[PDB]
Amino acid sequence: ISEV
Amino acid sequence: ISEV
Amino acid sequence: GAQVSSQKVGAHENSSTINYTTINYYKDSASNAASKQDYSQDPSKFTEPLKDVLIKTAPALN
Amino acid sequence: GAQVSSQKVGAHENSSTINYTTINYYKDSASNAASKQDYSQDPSKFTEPLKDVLIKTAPALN
Amino acid sequence: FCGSMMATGKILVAYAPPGAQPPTSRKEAMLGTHVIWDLGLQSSCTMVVPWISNVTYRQTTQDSFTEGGYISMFYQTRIVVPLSTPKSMSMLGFVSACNDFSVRLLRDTTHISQSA
Amino acid sequence: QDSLPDTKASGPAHSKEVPALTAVETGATNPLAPSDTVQTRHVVQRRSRSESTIESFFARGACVAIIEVDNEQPTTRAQKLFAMWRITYKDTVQLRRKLEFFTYSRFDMEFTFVVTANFTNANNGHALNQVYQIMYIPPGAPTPKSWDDYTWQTSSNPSIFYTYGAAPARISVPYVGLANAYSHFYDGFAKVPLKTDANDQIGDSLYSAMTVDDFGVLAVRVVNDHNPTKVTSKVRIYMKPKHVRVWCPRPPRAVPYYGPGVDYRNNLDPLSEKGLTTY
Amino acid sequence: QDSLPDTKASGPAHSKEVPALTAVETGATNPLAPSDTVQTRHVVQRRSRSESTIESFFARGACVAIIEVDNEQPTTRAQKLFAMWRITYKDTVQLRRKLEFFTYSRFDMEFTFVVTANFTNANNGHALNQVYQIMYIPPGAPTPKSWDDYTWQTSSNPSIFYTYGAAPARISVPYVGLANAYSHFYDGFAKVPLKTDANDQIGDSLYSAMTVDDFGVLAVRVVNDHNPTKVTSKVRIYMKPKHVRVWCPRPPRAVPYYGPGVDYRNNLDPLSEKGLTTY
Amino acid sequence: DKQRYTSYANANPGERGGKFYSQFNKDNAVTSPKREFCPVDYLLGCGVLLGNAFVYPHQIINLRTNNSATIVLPYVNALAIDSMVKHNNWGIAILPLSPLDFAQDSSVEIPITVTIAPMCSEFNGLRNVTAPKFQ
Amino acid sequence: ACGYSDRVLQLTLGNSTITTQEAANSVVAYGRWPEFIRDDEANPVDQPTEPDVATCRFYTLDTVMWGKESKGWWWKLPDALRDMGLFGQNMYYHYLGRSGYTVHVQCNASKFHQGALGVFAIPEYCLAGDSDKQRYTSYANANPGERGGKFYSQFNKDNAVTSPKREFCPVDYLLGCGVLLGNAFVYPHQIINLRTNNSATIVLPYVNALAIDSMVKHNNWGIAILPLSPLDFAQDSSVEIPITVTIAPMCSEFNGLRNVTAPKFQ
Amino acid sequence: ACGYSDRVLQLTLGNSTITTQEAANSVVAYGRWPEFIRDDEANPVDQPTEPDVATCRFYTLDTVMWGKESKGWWWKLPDALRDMGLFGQNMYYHYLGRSGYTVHVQCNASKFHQGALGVFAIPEYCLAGDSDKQRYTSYANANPGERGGKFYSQFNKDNAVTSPKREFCPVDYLLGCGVLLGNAFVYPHQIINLRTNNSATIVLPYVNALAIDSMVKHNNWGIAILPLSPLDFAQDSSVEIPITVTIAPMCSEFNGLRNVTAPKFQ
Numbered sequence A, B: 001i002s003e004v
Numbered sequence C, D: 001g002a003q004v005s006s007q008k009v010g011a012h013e014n015s016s017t018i019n020y021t022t023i024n025y026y027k028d029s030a031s032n033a034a035s036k037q038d039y040s041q042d043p044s045k046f047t048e049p050l051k052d053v054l055i056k057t058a059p060a061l062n
Numbered sequence E: 001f002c003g004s005m006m007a008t009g010k011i012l013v014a015y016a017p018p019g020a021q022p023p024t025s026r027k028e029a030m031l032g033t034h035v036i037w038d039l040g041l042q043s044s045c046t047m048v049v050p051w052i053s054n055v056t057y058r059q060t061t062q063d064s065f066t067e068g069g070y071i072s073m074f075y076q077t078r079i080v081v082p083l084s085t086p087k088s089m090s091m092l093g094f095v096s097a098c099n100d101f102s103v104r105l106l107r108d109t110t111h112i113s114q115s116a
Numbered sequence F, G: 001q002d003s004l005p006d007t008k009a010s011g012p013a014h015s016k017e018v019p020a021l022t023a024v025e026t027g028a029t030n031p032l033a034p035s036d037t038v039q040t041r042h043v044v045q046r047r048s049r050s051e052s053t054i055e056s057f058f059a060r061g062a063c064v065a066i067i068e069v070d071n072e073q074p075t076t077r078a079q080k081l082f083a084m085w086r087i088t089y090k091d092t093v094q095l096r097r098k099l100e101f102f103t104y105s106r107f108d109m110e111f112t113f114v115v116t117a118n119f120t121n122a123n124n125g126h127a128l129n130q131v132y133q134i135m136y137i138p139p140g141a142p143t144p145k146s147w148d149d150y151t152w153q154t155s156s157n158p159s160i161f162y163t164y165g166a167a168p169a170r171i172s173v174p175y176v177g178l179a180n181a182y183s184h185f186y187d188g189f190a191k192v193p194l195k196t197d198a199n200d201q202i203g204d205s206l207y208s209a210m211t212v213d214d215f216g217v218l219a220v221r222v223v224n225d226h227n228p229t230k231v232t233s234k235v236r237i238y239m240k241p242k243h244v245r246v247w248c249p250r251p252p253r254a255v256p257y258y259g260p261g262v263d264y265r266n267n268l269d270p271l272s273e274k275g276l277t278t279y
Numbered sequence H: 001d002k003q004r005y006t007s008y009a010n011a012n013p014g015e016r017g018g019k020f021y022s023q024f025n026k027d028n029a030v031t032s033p034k035r036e037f038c039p040v041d042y043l044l045g046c047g048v049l050l051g052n053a054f055v056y057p058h059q060i061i062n063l064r065t066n067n068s069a070t071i072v073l074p075y076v077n078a079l080a081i082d083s084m085v086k087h088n089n090w091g092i093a094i095l096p097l098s099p100l101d102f103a104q105d106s107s108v109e110i111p112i113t114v115t116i117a118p119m120c121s122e123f124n125g126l127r128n129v130t131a132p133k134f135q
Numbered sequence I, J: 001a002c003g004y005s006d007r008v009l010q011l012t013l014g015n016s017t018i019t020t021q022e023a024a025n026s027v028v029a030y031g032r033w034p035e036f037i038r039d040d041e042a043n044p045v046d047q048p049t050e051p052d053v054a055t056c057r058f059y060t061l062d063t064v065m066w067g068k069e070s071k072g073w074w075w076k077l078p079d080a081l082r083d084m085g086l087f088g089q090n091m092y093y094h095y096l097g098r099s100g101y102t103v104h105v106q107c108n109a110s111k112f113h114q115g116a117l118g119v120f121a122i123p124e125y126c127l128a129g130d131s132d133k134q135r136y137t138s139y140a141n142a143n144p145g146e147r148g149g150k151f152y153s154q155f156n157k158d159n160a161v162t163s164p165k166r167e168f169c170p171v172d173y174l175l176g177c178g179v180l181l182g183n184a185f186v187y188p189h190q191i192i193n194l195r196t197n198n199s200a201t202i203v204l205p206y207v208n209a210l211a212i213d214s215m216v217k218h219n220n221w222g223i224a225i226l227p228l229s230p231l232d233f234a235q236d237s238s239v240e241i242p243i244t245v246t247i248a249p250m251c252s253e254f255n256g257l258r259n260v261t262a263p264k265f266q
Ligand SMILES: Cc1cc(CCCCCCCOc2ccc(C3=NCCO3)cc2)on1
Pocket: F087, F088, F089, F109, F111, F134, F135, F136, F158, F159, F160, F171, F173, F176, F182, F183, F184, F215, F218
């Protein structure tokens, strides 16, 4: 995933 | 995830 | 981004801690459902708004 | 491939940082919703297009 | 000030926050937020209207509950010219937002329309 | 863990500590438990105040309005081909009274729309399924004069296109107040009369009213062109506060509401007759 | 963090620095804050420009067109059994004016279709649910002469088959311009008259028009064969720019639009009457 | 019969204050209306029951117990600051929860004096003086 | 560096800003900036009131006209400001008050006009009177408020012994007080010579024989403006230009609060 | 240091130099200096022509007169320069051309004159027309060359349906295009207020939706000069002063060489  |  | 919490189980089936899962789909927090995990507080600001709060076993007036 | 970001929470329930999740389903980026996390810039190219930009406390003309 | 260079003068420009009588005299206007502009080589003067309000956001429409107050202009001294000079001249006014300015709740404008 | 306090085992007393005696003149409520005046056993308490939390008390969709709109042939006398409603929790009494236990509030608002329709006349043929437009018009925006004029283009105003028969329409709204909290009560005016005023109309306002249009209006229309036979519809609006916070408690409304303010007119006799020494 | 600048605590001044004085002849706007001309306190600023971002300003579905199409018995005089619309944001005024705050733009485009229908005549029996075809015809492709001729086979053109009563149809389109950005304004011509030309018609063009067909057309028809009784339908097209970028700001349109270009005809008096020294 | 119609001058008695009434006498003169409040005592002058007014900050002067009451009020509002001329923040209500009586004298009368102090007072938006019309 | 000048000034006090593109530097009287009463010079024991931005800001007085026959104008402080917003109120609700001042005198004309104004800040400006009667000028006449007073070219003795005017008779070359005007330059001052400058700016400290006193009973400073050189323009015998006085109280503090003083000015 | 100033400028391009002792600083439109087409933004594959000093130099246009009834003047670029030396030739021998510009507007008068000119640089300055007929202004009329065009105080509709003039009808307060003139300041601009400055100087980048285009078919920039405040002098009701526009092409490059384009301007 990509957590920003 | 966030387990509370 | 899934959120996982314990349910307060009322009536138990003949089968311990049970959970549920929540995922916000929208950017605006206004769009969100209610978490309903709400903390409580003291009635004191309403039940005892006194400058000198006194202990119940002692005279209210002295 | 899930994307996770913080929401800017306005009105808070009596329950901290809250998130939401986004997943693109289509190959074409045209199909995508708007991210709405948009950066800002200086008005200067419009408010001050001067070759010699001057400090506000000093004379505009000298 | 778009007058001739030989022209002099001092002007008071003012802002009164809402709630009292709108200024009819320089005497009253002096008492609020104000700039005394002296004409000269620096042609222009800027008066900043500071955010002074009760509510956190005012309405874009007219409404006494979210009203902004009054702007007024008066002669501090007077326009003085020499002979062979124009005794009358134009002043131009400009307005813009300081960097603390913001807007919310997008809506359709009354400034454009279309017939059947 | 949200359970209430366990009852403590309490015995006999012969002492100079007197919890039963007090003085309510002070403004305070006596913090007493049964163990302070009677012999008590030990109870392990499992009960909880979960359902009386502010959120749980308001977490229910209340009917705040009934908007009636028709779809029929545009004639030249007054008609309901479109309708407008001023957004308020005050055309209805139930939710209004719940919100009024408090002076100030802050919350996000959920709007759910139940749409119903029927045939008016015995028979001129039938109608195909209708699409309804619900346009929000914030204070300042152009209001429609006609069911299909340019305002309905809704380029900047938010609008719902509801198809009849589909599940009820639902949207959420942020905390949109001009203040830091919504004022359920405003003791004051939007204008002050000044001695220097020309007429004394200039400084006249309604007591307790704030902004003239408060939150704007909802403009409802049927997007379909009219059938031969007439169809009447009603949009019921359900309102739910969510992510709720409240300040300063108030006594509940005890007599019937008489318009938008604290005004009473009649049925000022809320209480029944009961004999002093009658159980 | 997207909040605006905190106000700084500012005191009295007696100095040779004069921020209140300036010269607008330079072309620049004076960068002043309240602390430059008045005594100010310290404010910790929490307000934000989130809603005025270019995306947020245009993030709303605007009505750009109303296409009317009928389903009835094919007779031999002019009929609406199919219809064609030239794709444009200019048959409508609202979105047009918002886009026109800028000279050039680049964005993906979302099309949403609201379809409504009704019975025309008092009664010849009824109709079964209709399926609508919305065919995109890019410049060059064969245009239909008949509601059911070969073009509708749509083998290479994109088409939507909308079932009546279903949720409104929705598609997305890429940035499809021939240039690196869309030109909201074109000061020039598509043809030049040359001295060596035979007629002087040959080099004549419309001022400010670019390509003749710009983005092609949408051809709308009811796929169903006709009922005994006639059904009229309207397709409303909602257009939303997304993933938007814009260049070179322009003054907003102040007088009413008179066709596709910057031309004005009347109501050239936008401003009201107000006395110079009248609040 | 007119809702939200109490005039500014009548809503604001100044130092003089206002009074309560035992019952609702409707101002009937539609031609020249008094535009006054009609505060009924057991309804706390506002449509609710007086018995519940104790959820508000309060004290009781029961004459066998005390001479006086002392309440310290914070600034309470939906805003950090507002127009004092347009809006009142707090209302002081004094009602006889139990009627005055003395020996057997049917016409007893004692004074009530209210002394108030502003606290942490701050002001913004200076300009020319507001002169309200109180007539 | 950058482009700064003695001639171009900005003054900001409270919500008020003054600009001037033609100043002649600025004066701080006796080299002392205004300040508050120190604990070791303090005399009333009660906690003072310091209204700050609400009173220490620029009050503009009524404009006067300078013409070829103008002999001079005078004002007294705090008297000129007794009716100016919250400063006036503070002054009248208290027995004691002290304040410094920024005085800004304004008079622009043109490159072809002529004339020079002597602007003088005088500590304890006692003025001479009407009569054979000594020290007889009445309170109401000694204190004109914002309106100020005037000078005269010569001494006209108020003769009517039966109903005396009890007014000052300020003769110009005697600075209205028995001395010669030429020597008034030992006082804090500036000159508005029209070929040089638009304005005069003098910063006054609180000057007194006491740390604080009664503002209603006693004026600390007198402002005297006299035409050191007469106004003239082209050949027009009846020229007239405005003179505007704008004053700001500074470091204002007040002691002895009670009910308001209402002086009888009739 | 030494003695330098915002008011005194020298511009030198090619064999031409401009001086000005009374400027109001200078503007670079949108904060972008003119530049050549980068390899990664390039679109025509053929080697460009860059004439440099022969075309990127100061061409002075025919002087116009500003009088009390003057409503405003406008020009389009590159059109104003189509007949200017080797720039014109390069423009007409090629299908494609891009260029930036230094625009220098000149208007001096005297310390006793009065008036203010709004000089505006507008990207894609589409103008309104004559008729009931939309988008009907003819090429010859849309392009006046060096001569430029004018504004009008009001909309006179060309009525002759039989033989239409196919001209623009630019109304001044509507910036000739349906918007209000007061808002034209969002465009790159300068003001010539005669008490302040002789001239205006604006540097224009190449602005377009493409890296390069046809200069003959399309104008990139419009120059609009309007009297924001009318000309006036002493009491003479018929005052008249000159306005001279001098323009320089910058970073000019051309693609698509072939036989010369001869437009029909009749
Ligand atoms: C007084 C007071 C009032 C309240 C409730 C305030 C709620 C304010 C909401 C304002 C916006 O309401 C909208 C309702 C519907 C829509 C809508 N948009 C598309 C169709 O429905 C938009 C806004 O609490 N106290």
